[PDB]
Design an enzyme around this catalytic site. Structure first.
Site, PDB file in Angstrom:
ATOM      1  N   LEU A 297       0.829  -1.191   0.000  1.00 49.03           N
ATOM      2  CA  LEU A 297       0.000   0.000   0.000  1.00 49.03           C
ATOM      3  C   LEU A 297       0.871   1.251   0.000  1.00 49.03           C
ATOM      4  N   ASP A 298       0.263   2.370  -0.385  1.00 48.39           N
ATOM      5  CA  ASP A 298       1.003   3.598  -0.618  1.00 48.39           C
ATOM      6  C   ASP A 298       1.170   4.395   0.672  1.00 48.39           C
ATOM      7  CB  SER A 299       3.153   7.469   1.292  1.00 46.06           C
TER       8      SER A 299
END
Ligand SMILES: CCCCCCCCCCCCCC(=O)SCCNC(=O)CCNC(=O)[C@@H](O)C(C)(C)COP(=O)(O)O
Lengths: 87, 52, 102, 176, 459, 68
Positions: free
Chosen positions: A41-43
């Site tokens: 998953l992203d920041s």
């Protein structure tokens, strides 16, 4: 106004609110897991997770740290530092 | 126990000395013994004094 | 190649405690500090404070207060019992006065 | 103004904007459902041009985002009651006594609490035992003639404690 | 009165022929005995003063000030150790005998009859204070402090002598009754204006007034605690005592010639309360507080009401106790940390948890908490000056507000909010400083119960 | 196995000073109040009569309270 916190209990509560999150799986949800390498998953949703911890436990964490948690074990460690979790 | 220490006994002796000398000075200042218009009675009954 | 001084490195901060944990105010002589405490309380409070409190709580009529109270009582009773107005103005007698003339 | 580097970065600047706008949207929006709707809408608005290979248009949109944010903030942004500015701000600081005290007690009370003071004395001997050589050598050993950083290395060498730890470890417990 | 003079002499060779660990109990014990001895004085009644000789007498203005002096000496003498106990024995004996000679000339000054004798004993009051503050001034500008001190007080107090000799050889002798019982009014020729200006200006220097208040702050920030308490309490209220006596003469021109000094005092009271709101060097805030209270005193003296004189003498005694106490607490804090600054030493609600009670009690007396004597003084002075003019109450109340704010800032700046946690050397409170606080604030509350003593001649 | 350790500044010197202060005021606070209680319960204050005919008093025999 003093309920006792413990390491197993805070581990269970943090893993409960991570498992309740949508786009991860309850299968590959490890305590020693990355928010960058294996969960992928992203920041942005990582800081959504940081917001979930802040809104559950009742205190801000600073942005000098929110760059650099990236794993649930250091999350548990950092609320263990804010709360000084021993009886 | 006087010769044990005579240092500590000095200031009451000095106070009694100054008190006695103020008594002697006011008795040297014994003018107007009864000559006021507001405090004037006869010397009574025994010996001739109204303040000392 | 120069210092301009020769003395001790200063100061030496003496904790007055950590050699006498029972210590009162001044330096580490053990008995006479307790004597200082005993004299500044017994001859500073136990003979000065409560005795001065009794001595100044009452004494005679300082600046003739209650004498003036009872004297004014008797004088106003007299000036009611003899009809003349109380506190006659012109406190000096106008018979014994001489105005200079024009 | 931060201990790690001389600046945040562009990325964390946008990130702090996202955290602040999301927090102000909490402070604007009660009932939590329309809040969740508007939070996903804000997430989509940042999803519109996330993948700009450009940089100058990205920072110009960042500045215009700050303008539309500061126009649309809240009078009381919802500060938590543990944060500075908030309701607490060291609320129970009445009992946050530093621990250079508690050794200046009369030995009657040091007889009242014996084991704690014995263990505290061996803590202080642990402190002094490894104070000079390891800590001051690791401080005057690693860096450049200017330090130029506010971190410090651990005592990974063999044994004892990482340097300059006493006023970090021995703090108040934040609820006494 | 020689019953008080001569044991104050005989307390001096006591200090010489006592030895190490032997001077102290002798001086303190016997000075407290002299405090009881002058507590015996208060007999004064009704018609007039009381005459302790063909040479000495006591007005009822002089009785509470004299009792305040002989109360303040042993407190001061205990206060002035731990900063000179490690110095030499002969120098310590010289210090104690200097304070005793100082008190002796203070008793000489307060029990004056003739104004020339009063002037001689005025500058004899001056000369030990100089030597104390210069020898133990403890900072790099005690030179300039003593120099400013002596030249201001002498060169202001110099033509006062000439004016008093002129009054001596134009109106007979200078007994206070023969200054009274014979005084005739003196019209508005300019020589009368200069004579009034000379006397009133010398005591203006000694109050201080506002245009000459920079005499004060160096002479308190660079002084030891004994000379500071002496200077503040006894010397400023001694100057007020002197003007209160010599204002009996020259009443028919003081109305015409008193207008600039009142306005200088009022606007400078406002400016001084403003200037002690923001300074560092915590020791100096009490000094500018003292300038503010003495400006209020000078307003009360130049207006000539019995209400004004009662409020003036109450303000004198209460402010003397408040300033001497608060100087002693500032010395306690400087014994704690070697700073003298304000923003450094912080915290101290946790640590020393009953030193803060004395800081609070002093700060509320300087607030003029209402049963205390300071509110009695300030209130009657405000009443008398509102009868003086229907307009000056703006300045009095604005003084009250800014006085509240700087006194409270002194309270909650150094002793509220967070210890700086790099101090780690302050000891828990000794019995000595707590005893000094207890010697300050028992008589202030005990006079707060029964204050009919301390009001002036116009009771 | 529940309780913790508070960190106090000190109790010893403070309570020792206040114990000494109450003791050294109380040591002559009590007998003087007992004495003046015995005075105004035994010895009498005074009575409110006038000057007798052909008799001058002292400079005392003027006051209500006997200790004054
Ligand atoms: C209240 C009002 C708030 C609305 C704000 C207005 C909307 C403005 C925008 O759309 S954001 C302006 C610039 N946006 C950018 O994304 C600049 C470039 N940023 C990025 O590429 C980031 O998403 C990063 C570097 C991928 C972040 O990576 P983390 O996730 O690993």
């Amino acid at each position: 106004d003093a309920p006792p916190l413990t390491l197993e209990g805070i581990k269970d509560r943090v893993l409960y609110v991570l498992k309740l999150y949508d786009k991860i799986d309850p299968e590959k949800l490890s305590v020693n897991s990355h928010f960058m390498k294996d969960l992928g998953l992203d920041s942005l949703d990582q800081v959504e997770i940081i917001m979930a911890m802040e809104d559950e436990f009742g205190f801000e964490i600073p942005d000098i740290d929110a760059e650099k948690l990236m794993c649930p074990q250091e999350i548990v460690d950092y609320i263990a530092d804010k709360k000084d979790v021993y009886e | 126990v006087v010769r044990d220490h005579w240092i500590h006994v000095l200031v009451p002796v000095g106070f009694v000395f100054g008190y006695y000398l103020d008594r002697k000075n006011d008795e040297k200042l014994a003018a107007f013994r009864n000559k006021s218009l507001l405090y004037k009675r006869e010397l009574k009954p025994n010996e001739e004094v109204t303040w000392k | 190649p120069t210092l301009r001084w020769q003395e001790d490195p200063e100061p030496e901060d003496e904790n007055l405690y950590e050699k006498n944990p029972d210590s009162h105010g001044y330096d580490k002589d053990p008995a006479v500090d307790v004597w200082n405490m005993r004299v500044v309380f017994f001859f500073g409070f136990s003979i000065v404070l409560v005795l001065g409190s009794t001595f100044v709580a009452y004494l005679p009529d300082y600046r003739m207060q209650e004498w003036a109270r009872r004297e004014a009582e008797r004088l106003v009773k007299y000036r009611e019992a003899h009809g003349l107005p109380l506190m006659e103005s012109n406190c000096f007698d106008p018979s014994k006065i001489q105005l200079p003339e024009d | 103004f931060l201990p790690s580097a001389a600046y945040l970065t562009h990325q964390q600047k946008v990130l702090q904007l996202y955290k602040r706008a999301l927090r102000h949207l909490e402070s604007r929006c009660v009932h939590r459902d329309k809040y969740r709707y508007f939070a996903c809408l804000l997430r989509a608005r940042f999803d519109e041009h996330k993948n700009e290979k450009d940089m100058v248009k990205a920072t110009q949109l960042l500045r215009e985002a700050e303008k539309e944010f500061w126009h649309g903030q809240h009078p009381q942004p919802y500060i938590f009651p543990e944060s500075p500015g908030g309701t607490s701000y060291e609320r129970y600081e009445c009992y946050k006594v530093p621990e250079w005290c508690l050794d200046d007690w009369h030995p009657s009370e040091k007889a009242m609490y014996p084991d704690y003071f014995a263990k505290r004395e061996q803590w202080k001997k642990l402190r002094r035992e490894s104070w000079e050589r390891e800590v001051k050598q690791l401080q005057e050993e690693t860096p450049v003639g200017g330090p130029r950083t506010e971190a410090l290395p651990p005592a990974r060498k063999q044994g004892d404690l990482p340097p300059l730890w006493w006023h970090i470890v021995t703090r108040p417990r934040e609820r006494p | 009165m020689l019953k008080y003079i001569i044991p104050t002499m005989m307390l001096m060779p006591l200090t010489w022929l006592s030895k190490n660990s032997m001077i102290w109990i002798n001086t303190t014990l016997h000075s407290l005995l002299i405090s009881l001895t002058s507590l015996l004085l208060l007999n004064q009644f009704g018609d007039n003063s009381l005459n302790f000789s063909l040479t000495f007498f006591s007005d009822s203005l002089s009785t509470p000030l004299l009792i305040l002096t002989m109360w303040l000496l042993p407190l001061m003498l205990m206060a002035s150790q731990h900063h000179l106990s490690k110095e030499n024995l002969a120098r310590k004996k010289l210090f104690i005998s200097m304070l005793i000679l100082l008190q002796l000339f203070l008793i000489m000054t307060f029990t004056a009859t003739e104004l020339i004798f009063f002037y001689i004993m005025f500058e004899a009051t001056l000369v030990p204070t100089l030597i104390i503050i210069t020898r133990w001034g403890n900072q790099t500008e005690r030179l300039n402090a003593g120099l400013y001190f002596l030249f201001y007080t002498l060169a202001g107090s110099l033509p006062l002598l000439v004016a008093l000799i002129y009054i001596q050889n134009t109106m007979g002798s200078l007994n206070f009754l023969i200054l009274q019982y014979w005084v005739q009014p003196m019209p508005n020729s300019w020589s009368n204006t200069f004579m009034w200006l000379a006397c009133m200006m010398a005591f203006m220097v000694k109050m201080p007034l506002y245009g000459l208040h920079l005499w004060l702050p160096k002479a308190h920030v660079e002084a030891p605690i004994a000379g500071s308490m002496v200077l503040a309490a006894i010397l400023l209220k001694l100057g007020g005592y002197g003007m209160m006596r010599i204002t009996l003469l020259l009443n028919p021109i003081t109305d015409f010639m008193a207008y600039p000094f009142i306005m200088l005092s009022l606007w400078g009271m406002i400016m001084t309360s403003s200037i002690c709101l923001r300074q560092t060097d915590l020791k100096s805030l009490i000094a500018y507080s003292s300038v503010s209270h003495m400006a209020l005193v000078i307003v009360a003296i130049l207006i000539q009401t019995p209400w004004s004189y009662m409020g003036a003498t109450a303000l004198m005694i209460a402010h003397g106790l408040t300033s001497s106490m608060l100087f002693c607490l500032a010395n306690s804090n400087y014994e704690r940390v070697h700073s003298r600054t304000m923003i450094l030493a912080r915290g101290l609600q946790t640590l020393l948890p009953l030193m803060a009670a004395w800081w609070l009690l002093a700060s509320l007396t300087n607030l003029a908490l209402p049963p205390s004597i300071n509110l009695i003084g300030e209130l009657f002075v405000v009443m008398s000056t509102f009868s003086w003019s229907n307009i000056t109450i703006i300045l009095m109340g604005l003084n009250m507000v800014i006085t509240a704010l700087y006194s409270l800032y002194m309270l909650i700046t150094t002793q509220r909010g967070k210890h700086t946690h790099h101090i780690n050397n302050i000891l828990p409170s000794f019995t000595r400083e707590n005893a000094l606080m207890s010697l300050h604030m028992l008589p202030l509350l005990l006079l707060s119960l029964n204050p009919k003593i301390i009001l002036g001649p116009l009771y | 196995g529940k309780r913790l350790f508070i960190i106090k500044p000190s109790g010893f010197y403070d309570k020792r000073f206040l114990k000494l202060l109450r003791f050294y005021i109380l040591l002559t606070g009590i007998p003087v109040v007992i004495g003046i209680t015995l005075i105004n319960v035994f010895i009498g204050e005074a009575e409110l009569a006038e000057i007798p005919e052909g008799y001058v008093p002292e400079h005392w025999e003027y006051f209500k309270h006997p200790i004054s």
